Amino acid sequence: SLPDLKIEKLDEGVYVHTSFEEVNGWGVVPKHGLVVLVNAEAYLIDTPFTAKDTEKLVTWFVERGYKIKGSISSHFHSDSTGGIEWLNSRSIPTYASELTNELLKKDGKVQATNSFSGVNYWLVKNKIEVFYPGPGHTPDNVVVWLPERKILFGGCFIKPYGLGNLGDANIEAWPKSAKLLKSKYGKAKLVVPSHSEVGDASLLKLTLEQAVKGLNESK
Numbered sequence: 702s703l704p705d706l707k708i709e710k711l712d713e714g715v716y717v718h719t720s721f722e723e724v725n726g727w728g729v730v731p732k733h734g735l736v737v738l739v740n741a742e743a744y745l746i747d748t749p750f751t752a753k754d755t756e757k758l759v760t761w762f763v764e765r766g767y768k769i770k771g772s773i774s775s776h777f778h779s780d781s782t783g784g785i786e787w788l789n790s791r792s793i794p795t796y797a798s799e800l801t802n803e804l805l806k807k808d809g810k811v812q813a814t815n816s817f818s819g820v821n822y823w824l825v826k827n828k829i830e831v832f833y834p835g836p837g838h839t840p841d842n843v844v845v846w847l848p849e850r851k852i853l854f855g856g857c858f859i860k861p862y863g864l865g866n867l868g869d870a871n872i873e874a875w876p877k878s879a880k881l882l883k884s885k886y887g888k889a890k891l892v893v894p895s896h897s898e899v900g901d902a903s904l905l906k907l908t909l910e911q912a913v914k915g916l917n918e919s920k
């Protein structure tokens with residue numbers, strides 16, 4: 702059936718987790734998120750699709766001696782938030798922007814217990830930053846920046862070979878948001894997309910190019 706949850710070291714104290722789902726109309730979708738280690742503590746950057754894999758992801762780090770201090774969801778879709786309910790049931794703090802929690806509530810989905818609003822937010826000061834470049838893939842999508850490793854988790858915003866499903870997208874705003882994102886993190890050493898392979902800062906340019914190309918054809 703579906704492939705198993707995967708966990709791979711990317712850099713010191715930085716892991717990529719990859720989960721898999723059948724999405725009607727698209728087949729098997731891979732989803733990359735991160736687990737970031739601060740000392741003996743771990744932060745989930747997005748949850749896997751399901752409580753099952755969220756649980757597997759968590760026990761993997763706990764069994765290796767890391768306390769799960771919290772999770773942050775980069776946007777409201779299931780591939781970033783699907784594990785929030787299970788995490789909440791274990792009293793592991795969950796984080797999302799006000800807009801994300803609003804979009805979850807509208808959909809009748811479980812909200813993160815902690816919310817933030819504003820362009821920038823430190824989940825962990827000087828270690829894990831959250832940035833809102835504007836609407837793109839969804840109205841609420843944010844990225845997560847690791848200044849010590851110069852690693853950017855781009856989430857589902859980063860779409861280098863095509864925009865994917867535009868159901869909740871803001872096609873007008875996406876080029877402007879992508880330009881802002883490129884401005885801010887052009888010096889990223891690594892960029893981690895949700896649905897494609899890890900690349901360098903060039904993925905920011907391609908995303909902008911795909912966004913611009915996507916808008917013109919819309920007209």
Ligand SMILES: CC1(C)S[C@H]2CS[C@H](CS)N2[C@@H]1C(=O)O
Binds near residue numbers: 724730780864865896
């Ligand atoms: C374009 C897709 C295959 S369809 C959509 C469902 S979940 C995930 C985005 S959140 N997704 C795929 C994608 O964007 O790669």
Ligand SMILES: [Zn+2]
Binds near residue numbers: 776778838839857
């Ligand atoms: Zn999405």
Ligand SMILES: [Zn+2]
Binds near residue numbers: 778857
């Ligand atoms: Zn996604």
